[PDB]
Amino acid sequence: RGNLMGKRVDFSARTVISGDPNLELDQVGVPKSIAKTLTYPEVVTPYNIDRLTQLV
Amino acid sequence: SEGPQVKIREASKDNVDFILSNVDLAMANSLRRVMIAEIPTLAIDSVEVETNTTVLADEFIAHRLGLIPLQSMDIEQLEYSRDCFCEDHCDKCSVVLTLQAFGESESTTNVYSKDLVIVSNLMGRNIGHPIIQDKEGNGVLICKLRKGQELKLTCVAKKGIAKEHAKWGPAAAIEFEYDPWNKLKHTDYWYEQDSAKEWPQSKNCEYEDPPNEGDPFDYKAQADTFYMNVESVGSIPVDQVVVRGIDTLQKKVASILLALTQMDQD
Amino acid sequence: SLHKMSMMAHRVKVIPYSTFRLNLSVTSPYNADFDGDEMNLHVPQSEETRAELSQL
Amino acid sequence: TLKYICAECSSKLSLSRTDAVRCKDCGHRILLKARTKRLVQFEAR
Amino acid sequence: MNAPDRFELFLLGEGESKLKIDPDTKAPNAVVITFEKEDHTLGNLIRAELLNDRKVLFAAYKVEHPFFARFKLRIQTTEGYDPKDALKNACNSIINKLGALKTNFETEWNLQTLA
Amino acid sequence: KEKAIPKDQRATTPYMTKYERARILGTRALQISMNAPVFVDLEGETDPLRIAMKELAEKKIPLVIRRYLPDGSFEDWSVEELIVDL
Amino acid sequence: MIVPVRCFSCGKVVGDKWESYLNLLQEDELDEGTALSRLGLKRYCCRRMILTHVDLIEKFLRYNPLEKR
Amino acid sequence: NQEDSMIMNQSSIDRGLFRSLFFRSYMDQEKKYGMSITETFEKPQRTNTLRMKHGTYDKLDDDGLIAPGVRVSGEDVIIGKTTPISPDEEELGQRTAYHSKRDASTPLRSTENGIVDQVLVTTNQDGLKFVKVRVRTTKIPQIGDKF
Ligand SMILES: [Mg+2]
Ligand SMILES: [Zn+2]
Ligand SMILES: [Zn+2]
Ligand SMILES: [Zn+2]
């Protein structure tokens, strides 16, 4: 129960939640410091070579 | 000249009470918003602590020092440190004040803002001096020392606006009211038995005639004739708060006009 | 997280400050308020789970 | 050597890594490291 | 800590322009101007002045999020009247009104005695 | 192969399920990200998921769904022949 | 701990009135309401600034200094 | 302010409304592992100390302590300490005859920062040297604080 059915995971974040009347129903506001820690592995393709190069 | 009109009811070195007539509500609101948030002012921004044996913290004392009102009459002759060509600060964009206090006596010795000494070259300007606005001649009670305690620090004052930090605001509460008789029906008065008996009459009700007690609602009337009272912290004269608020607002509209012109060429 | 609406997929909006921000209408499915509640964020790591998350 | 201060008699001492941690005047066993003499900068906000 | 620096409210950043004018396709002769490093102070004043022009059919501004100091201004004028010219005229009207107000206050203040 | 039901007696729904659509879009999106040949014309699109959606709308995903039955038998359904109505 | 420099709500300077406030209370035998108005504090935002302040620095000053010069 | 949230005046915050001091103390002792192995408060060097932390030791003095009044931040070492090691143990290479010490320092909390407020050095009941370091920081209300 403590290590197989549930476990601690990577690529996650926790903080206090606030209410934003100016966000869409499906949007979530993410603090900038958290967005810099969490990453997404994006594969290099002809459609994203330039954008990924600038990010690097 | 036949535009917005002004009538001053009460003038002082700390408060100016006037009636702003023949104006729009948007203009009146922008005037008070600019007077609160966008009039440049001189205030202590960085503090170097050399000795601090007081019962207060350095950050505690620094916050207090930044809230002390300094003279800002010639603030326009000063520059923004961000817009100046100097490493850290110079005489063209800053004023330097030193505070040296020692507990030489057995009784508690009080450190006031009158003890701040300007050690920069003011270059004949009229900025930097702490504002003394009391009877005894002292200023703000900065700190208290007992025997053997010392406070040694150097303050650097820069110009800014209350949008960056409230310490650069030259204005205290601003009174702003229109239509004291509620003839435009912009408020729906909460009451229990009778709203007229339950809501005290504004002092400005004496400058306007009451409703004619039975005439139809005037749907063509727009808000004007605003009653405003501007208070000043003393950094700049209260009359200058109004004048420079108009100047700041006028410049902001001009900047939009200039930016529009710059886009036209390209 | 007593029911499946307590885990829902949102679109990221990177923002200033240190709190998560969400629309008011999604507070009832989460059984959440803004008196100090904290919520968890999980980032998918592949195109499979990334489309799965946004399509289900 | 570095300079310390007694916590009861406020006497300024100079101790080395070999000296015992104690006030040579009154005998207290708690010493306060003296404040650094390099200037520190603070924003007034 | 994620507190943005307070000078981001008024100081215009690098590669960022004060104005951004883009045509509006939802209606004819309509344009949307994005003001950077501004707030309700200019938006309310400019929008109110525009509404006094008889050749303006629509005028509205909004601050989409209070976190960022920018507001949008939508202007639609009558055919043959350029929305940029409408903004020019309104801005001139505000400047002239403010200039008159400053003179009126100064002449009235010089008549007082207590201060 | 007794567990492959012939196409003439398939008794499953002729409609794509939500889970089938989700995996097909994710499956093809992953392939596109790995430089897979796109069989639909792109009028300007860089997100693999959006390209997959365009392919699904135009029925150009060369995959089949092997629907399994609780007894081990299965049915093969092409993504092109499956109705996307949900 | 010590008197705030400014009123929190409106920013009027109130840190130069603490000693005047105490002197009015002690020697002039004025009630705190009259003293607050005599000092020019009209808005109740400013009145509570001086009326609810607790002077703890006086307590802290009773301890001998950590470092004497 | 919907659903139990509130709006605070930034101007009031600027003037000091609900602003507070935060103090944190760090404790460390000079342990004696019997009769042979002993620790000392020191500013370790990268040439004689192993497993030194990636932070900075620039603020320590020769006694392994930061003087009060110095500003500290994340990963900064505030109590420098070293202990001797036993030979014939090589990790990731990098263990040469030069190395005879290993870092046992105390770094500041990763998320916390501030100014060192007080450092006291004394001895425990057993006569071993141990120190306390206190760090000051100011907390200003923001969009996640509870009131
Ligand atoms: Mg709760
Ligand atoms: Zn300069
Ligand atoms: Zn002693
Ligand atoms: Zn007040």
Coordinates of C-alpha atoms in Angstrom, one line a residue, chain H:
Chain H
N1 CA -11.8 37.7 -2.0
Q2 CA -14.3 34.9 -2.9
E3 CA -14.3 31.7 -1.0
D4 CA -12.5 32.8 2.1
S5 CA -9.8 34.9 0.4
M6 CA -9.0 38.6 1.1
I7 CA -7.7 41.7 -0.6
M8 CA -4.9 43.5 1.2
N9 CA -3.7 47.0 0.6
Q10 CA -0.2 47.0 -0.9
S11 CA 0.3 50.6 0.3
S12 CA -0.5 49.4 3.9
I13 CA 2.0 46.5 3.4
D14 CA 4.6 49.0 2.2
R15 CA 4.2 51.0 5.3
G16 CA 4.7 48.0 7.6
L17 CA 1.2 46.5 8.1
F18 CA 1.5 42.9 9.4
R19 CA 5.2 42.7 8.8
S20 CA 7.2 40.4 11.1
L21 CA 10.7 39.2 12.0
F22 CA 11.7 35.5 11.6
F23 CA 14.5 34.0 13.6
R24 CA 16.1 30.6 13.1
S25 CA 18.9 29.0 15.1
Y26 CA 21.3 26.4 14.0
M27 CA 23.1 24.1 16.5
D28 CA 26.3 22.2 16.0
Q29 CA 28.8 20.4 18.3
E30 CA 32.4 19.2 18.1
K31 CA 31.9 15.5 18.7
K32 CA 34.7 13.3 20.0
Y33 CA 34.4 9.7 18.5
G34 CA 36.2 8.1 21.4
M35 CA 40.0 8.6 21.9
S36 CA 41.3 9.0 18.3
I37 CA 38.8 10.6 15.9
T38 CA 37.7 14.2 16.8
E39 CA 36.1 17.1 14.9
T40 CA 36.9 20.8 14.8
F41 CA 35.2 23.9 13.6
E42 CA 37.2 25.0 10.5
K43 CA 37.0 26.7 7.1
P44 CA 37.8 23.6 5.0
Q45 CA 39.9 24.0 1.8
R46 CA 39.1 22.2 -1.4
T47 CA 42.6 20.6 -1.4
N48 CA 42.5 18.9 2.0
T49 CA 38.7 18.3 2.5
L50 CA 36.5 15.7 0.7
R51 CA 32.8 15.8 0.1
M52 CA 32.7 19.6 0.4
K53 CA 29.3 21.1 -0.3
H54 CA 28.6 22.9 -3.6
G55 CA 27.8 26.1 -1.7
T56 CA 30.3 28.9 -0.8
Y57 CA 32.6 29.0 2.2
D58 CA 33.7 32.6 1.5
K59 CA 31.8 34.0 4.5
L60 CA 33.4 31.7 7.2
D61 CA 36.3 32.8 9.4
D62 CA 39.2 30.8 10.6
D63 CA 37.0 29.4 13.4
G64 CA 34.4 28.2 11.0
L65 CA 31.7 30.7 11.9
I66 CA 30.1 33.7 10.0
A67 CA 30.4 36.9 11.9
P68 CA 27.0 38.5 12.9
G69 CA 25.7 41.1 10.5
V70 CA 26.7 39.2 7.3
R71 CA 24.0 38.4 4.8
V72 CA 23.5 34.8 3.9
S73 CA 21.4 32.9 1.3
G74 CA 20.6 29.4 0.2
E75 CA 23.3 26.8 0.2
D76 CA 25.6 29.1 2.2
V77 CA 27.7 27.4 4.8
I78 CA 27.2 29.1 8.2
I79 CA 29.1 26.6 10.5
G80 CA 32.2 25.0 8.9
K81 CA 33.3 21.7 10.4
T82 CA 35.6 18.9 9.3
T83 CA 36.4 15.4 10.6
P84 CA 39.3 13.1 9.8
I85 CA 38.8 10.0 7.7
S86 CA 40.3 6.4 7.6
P87 CA 42.6 5.6 4.6
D88 CA 42.0 2.8 2.1
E89 CA 38.6 4.2 1.1
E90 CA 38.3 5.7 -2.4
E91 CA 35.1 7.1 -3.7
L92 CA 34.6 8.3 -7.3
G93 CA 38.3 8.5 -7.5
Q94 CA 39.0 12.1 -6.4
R95 CA 40.6 10.8 -3.2
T96 CA 44.4 11.5 -3.3
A97 CA 47.1 11.6 -0.6
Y98 CA 46.4 15.3 -0.3
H99 CA 43.0 14.7 1.2
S100 CA 43.0 14.0 4.9
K101 CA 39.7 15.7 6.0
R102 CA 36.1 15.4 5.0
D103 CA 33.5 18.2 5.2
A104 CA 30.9 18.0 8.0
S105 CA 29.6 21.6 7.6
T106 CA 26.1 23.0 8.2
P107 CA 24.6 24.8 5.3
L108 CA 21.7 27.3 5.5
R109 CA 18.3 26.0 4.6
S110 CA 17.9 25.9 0.8
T111 CA 14.7 28.1 0.6
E112 CA 15.7 30.5 3.5
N113 CA 17.8 33.6 3.5
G114 CA 18.6 36.5 5.7
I115 CA 21.3 38.1 7.9
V116 CA 23.2 36.3 10.6
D117 CA 22.0 37.9 13.8
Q118 CA 24.0 36.2 16.6
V119 CA 26.7 33.6 17.1
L120 CA 27.5 32.3 20.5
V121 CA 30.3 29.7 21.3
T122 CA 30.3 27.8 24.5
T123 CA 30.8 24.3 25.9
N124 CA 28.2 21.6 26.8
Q125 CA 27.9 19.4 29.9
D126 CA 30.7 17.2 28.6
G127 CA 33.1 20.1 27.8
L128 CA 32.9 19.8 24.0
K129 CA 32.7 23.0 22.0
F130 CA 29.3 23.7 20.4
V131 CA 27.9 26.9 18.7
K132 CA 24.6 28.5 18.0
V133 CA 24.0 30.7 14.9
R134 CA 20.8 32.7 14.6
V135 CA 19.7 34.2 11.2
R136 CA 17.3 37.1 10.8
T137 CA 14.8 37.6 8.0
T138 CA 11.7 39.8 7.4
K139 CA 8.5 38.4 6.2
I140 CA 6.2 40.7 4.2
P141 CA 2.6 39.7 3.5
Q142 CA 2.0 38.2 0.1
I143 CA -0.7 36.3 -1.8
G144 CA -0.3 33.1 0.1
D145 CA -0.2 34.2 3.8
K146 CA -3.0 33.3 6.2
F147 CA -4.8 35.9 8.3

